[PDB]
CSV table of N, CA, C and O in Angstrom, one decimal:
chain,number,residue,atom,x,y,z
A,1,UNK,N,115.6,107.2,120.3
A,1,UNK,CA,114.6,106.9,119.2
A,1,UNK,C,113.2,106.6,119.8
A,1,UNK,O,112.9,106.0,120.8
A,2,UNK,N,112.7,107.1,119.1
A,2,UNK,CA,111.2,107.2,119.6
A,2,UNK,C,110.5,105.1,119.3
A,2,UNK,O,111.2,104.2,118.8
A,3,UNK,N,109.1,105.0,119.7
A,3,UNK,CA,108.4,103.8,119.5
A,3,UNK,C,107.5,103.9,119.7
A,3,UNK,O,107.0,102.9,120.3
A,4,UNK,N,106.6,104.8,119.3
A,4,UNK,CA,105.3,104.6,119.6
A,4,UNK,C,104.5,103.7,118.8
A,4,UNK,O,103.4,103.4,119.1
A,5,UNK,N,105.2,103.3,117.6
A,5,UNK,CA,104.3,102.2,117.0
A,5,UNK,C,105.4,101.8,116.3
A,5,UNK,O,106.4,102.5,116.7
A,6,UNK,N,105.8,101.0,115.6
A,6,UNK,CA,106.4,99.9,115.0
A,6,UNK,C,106.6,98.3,115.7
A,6,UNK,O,107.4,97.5,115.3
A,7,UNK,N,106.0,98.2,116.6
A,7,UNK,CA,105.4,97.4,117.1
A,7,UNK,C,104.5,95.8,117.2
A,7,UNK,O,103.6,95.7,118.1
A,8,UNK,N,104.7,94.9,116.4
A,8,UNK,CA,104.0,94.0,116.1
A,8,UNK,C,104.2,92.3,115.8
A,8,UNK,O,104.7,91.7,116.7
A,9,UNK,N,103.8,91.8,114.7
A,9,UNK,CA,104.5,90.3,114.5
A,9,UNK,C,105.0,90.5,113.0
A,9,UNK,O,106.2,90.7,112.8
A,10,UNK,N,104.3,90.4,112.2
A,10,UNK,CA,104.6,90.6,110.9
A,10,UNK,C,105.7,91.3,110.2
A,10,UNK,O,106.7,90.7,109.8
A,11,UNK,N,105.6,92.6,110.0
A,11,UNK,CA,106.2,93.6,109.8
A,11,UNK,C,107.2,93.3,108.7
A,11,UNK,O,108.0,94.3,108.5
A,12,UNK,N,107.3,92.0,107.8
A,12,UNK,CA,108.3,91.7,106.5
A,12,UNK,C,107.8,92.0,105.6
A,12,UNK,O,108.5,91.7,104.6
A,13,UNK,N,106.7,92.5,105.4
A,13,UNK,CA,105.6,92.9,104.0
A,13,UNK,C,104.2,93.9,103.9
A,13,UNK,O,103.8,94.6,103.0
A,14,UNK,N,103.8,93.5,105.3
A,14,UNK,CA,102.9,94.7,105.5
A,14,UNK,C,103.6,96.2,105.7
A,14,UNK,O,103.1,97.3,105.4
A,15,UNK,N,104.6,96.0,106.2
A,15,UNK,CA,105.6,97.4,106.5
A,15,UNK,C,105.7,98.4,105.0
A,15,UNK,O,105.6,99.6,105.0
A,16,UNK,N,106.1,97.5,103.7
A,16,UNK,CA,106.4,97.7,102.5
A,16,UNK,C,105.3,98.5,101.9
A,16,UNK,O,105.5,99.4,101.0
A,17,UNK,N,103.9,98.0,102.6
A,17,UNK,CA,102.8,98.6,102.1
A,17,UNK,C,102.6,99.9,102.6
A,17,UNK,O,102.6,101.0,102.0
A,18,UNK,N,102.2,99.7,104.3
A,18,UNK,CA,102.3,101.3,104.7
A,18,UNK,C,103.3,102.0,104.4
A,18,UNK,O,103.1,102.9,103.6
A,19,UNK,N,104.1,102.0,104.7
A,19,UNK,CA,106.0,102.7,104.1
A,19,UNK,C,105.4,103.3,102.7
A,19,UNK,O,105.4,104.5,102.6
A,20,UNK,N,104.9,102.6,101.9
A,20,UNK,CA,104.3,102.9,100.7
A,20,UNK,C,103.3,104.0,101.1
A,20,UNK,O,103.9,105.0,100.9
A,21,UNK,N,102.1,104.1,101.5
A,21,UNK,CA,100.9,104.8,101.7
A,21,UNK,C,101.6,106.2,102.3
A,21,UNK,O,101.4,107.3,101.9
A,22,UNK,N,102.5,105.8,103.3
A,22,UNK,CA,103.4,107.0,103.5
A,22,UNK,C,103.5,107.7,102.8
A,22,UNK,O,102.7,108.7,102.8
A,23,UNK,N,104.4,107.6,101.8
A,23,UNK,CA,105.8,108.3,101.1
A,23,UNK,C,104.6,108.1,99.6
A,23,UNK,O,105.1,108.2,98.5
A,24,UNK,N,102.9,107.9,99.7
A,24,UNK,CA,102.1,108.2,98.2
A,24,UNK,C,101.8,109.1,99.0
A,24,UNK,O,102.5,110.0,99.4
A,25,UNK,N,100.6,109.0,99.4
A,25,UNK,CA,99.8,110.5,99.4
A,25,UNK,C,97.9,110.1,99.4
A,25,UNK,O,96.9,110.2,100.2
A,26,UNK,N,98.1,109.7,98.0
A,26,UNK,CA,96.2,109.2,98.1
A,26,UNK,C,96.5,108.5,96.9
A,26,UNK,O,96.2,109.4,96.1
A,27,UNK,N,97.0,107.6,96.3
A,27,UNK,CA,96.9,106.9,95.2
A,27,UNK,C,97.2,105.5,95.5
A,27,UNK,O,96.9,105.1,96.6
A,28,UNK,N,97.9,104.5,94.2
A,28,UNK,CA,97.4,103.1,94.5
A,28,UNK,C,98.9,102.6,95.1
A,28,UNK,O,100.1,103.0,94.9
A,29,UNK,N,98.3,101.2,96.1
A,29,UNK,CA,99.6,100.6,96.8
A,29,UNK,C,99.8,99.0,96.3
A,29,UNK,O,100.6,98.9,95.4
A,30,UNK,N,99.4,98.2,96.7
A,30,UNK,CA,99.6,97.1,96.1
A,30,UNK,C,98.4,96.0,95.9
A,30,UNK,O,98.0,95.6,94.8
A,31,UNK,N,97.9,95.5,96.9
A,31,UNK,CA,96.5,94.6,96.8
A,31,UNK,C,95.7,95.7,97.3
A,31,UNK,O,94.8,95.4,96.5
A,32,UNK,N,95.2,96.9,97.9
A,32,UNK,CA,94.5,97.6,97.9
A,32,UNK,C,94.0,98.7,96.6
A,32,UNK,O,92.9,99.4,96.6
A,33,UNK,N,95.1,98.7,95.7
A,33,UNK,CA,94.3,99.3,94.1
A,33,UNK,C,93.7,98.1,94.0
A,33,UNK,O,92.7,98.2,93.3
A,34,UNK,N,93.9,96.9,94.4
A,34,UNK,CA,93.2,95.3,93.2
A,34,UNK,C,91.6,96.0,94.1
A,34,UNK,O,90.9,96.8,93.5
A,35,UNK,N,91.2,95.5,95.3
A,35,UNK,CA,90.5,95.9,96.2
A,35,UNK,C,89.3,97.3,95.4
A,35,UNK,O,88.2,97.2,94.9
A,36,UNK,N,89.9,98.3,95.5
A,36,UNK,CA,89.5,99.5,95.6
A,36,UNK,C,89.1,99.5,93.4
A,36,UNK,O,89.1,100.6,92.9
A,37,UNK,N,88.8,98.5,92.6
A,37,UNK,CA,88.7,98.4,91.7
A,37,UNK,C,87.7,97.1,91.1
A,37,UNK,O,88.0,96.3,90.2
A,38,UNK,N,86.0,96.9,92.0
A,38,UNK,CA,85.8,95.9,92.1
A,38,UNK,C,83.9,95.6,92.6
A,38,UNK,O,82.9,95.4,92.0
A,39,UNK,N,84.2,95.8,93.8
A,39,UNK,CA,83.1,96.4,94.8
A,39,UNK,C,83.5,97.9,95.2
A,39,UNK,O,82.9,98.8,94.7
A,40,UNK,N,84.3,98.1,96.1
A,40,UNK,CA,84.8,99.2,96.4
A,40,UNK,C,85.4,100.1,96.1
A,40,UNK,O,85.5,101.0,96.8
């Protein structure tokens, strides 16, 4: 099995998000639609 990244401290929630961004495409994920609806 490969490892070039999965790698880190966190990874119980932030993982959920990218995993997410993955498997969307270009649409919304979780605190970044709140984010991207505001200023930016």
């Amino acid at each position: 099995d490969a490892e070039f990244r999965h790698d880190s401290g966190y990874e119980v929630h932030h993982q959920k998000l990218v995993f997410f961004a993955e498997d969307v495409g270009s649409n919304k994920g979780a605190i970044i639609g709140l984010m991207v609806g505001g200023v930016v």
